[PDB]
Amino acid sequence: IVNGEEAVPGSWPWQVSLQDKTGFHFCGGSLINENWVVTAAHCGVTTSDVVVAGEFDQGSSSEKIQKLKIAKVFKNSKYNSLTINNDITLLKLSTAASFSQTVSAVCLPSASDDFAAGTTCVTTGWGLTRY
Amino acid sequence: ANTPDRLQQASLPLLSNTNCKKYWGTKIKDAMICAGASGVSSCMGDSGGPLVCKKNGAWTLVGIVSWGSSTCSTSTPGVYARVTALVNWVQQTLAAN
């Protein structure tokens, strides 16, 4: 995020980091329950990547984080790689996340819910702060 | 480029798809929602993470960080996967697995 600010630690408890086998953060995701993460299809997750829950400072070794194996990647069948449309994947965890103060789920909308233009929302992540 | 160690946040407004098309044209599909163009931008490495809106006291996943400006320009809108268009598939997948 360019021109954002640091979050209060633990205050976005559904936010996960997708890390490759080398430990490199390459995408975010959101817990929707103890067993499932929603992310973008274009992130290209495989069962060799790791879901990391509970992080704030990825430079710290003192946070009680959960490194969760991925059992199966469910890319939305309507995902179109050419247009990047329907850009959603579900990750089924091999073992459940343990929910806590710092690890818990985001709500999902109904298909008919209205989120009007002009509404102020929030986005979070460990993406670049400067290109 | 700068990658942060610490989790970042930003508030930002939802756009209409019609207005978003003024920036991105026919790249904008019904299963996308734009947000930003407001002095902040999602950027590389944010992809897959949440765009949440507070409704009746709870944060609800409205978007998934998807794509946008190749320089993360804060005056152009970011593009997010529109979760309302995708949630029936989420529910079907959870139910079947």
Partner: peptide
């Protein structure tokens, strides 16, 4: 869902 135990501050 959707109600963090540690409230975000924007």
């Amino acid at each position: 869902c959707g109600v963090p135990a540690i409230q975000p501050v924007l």
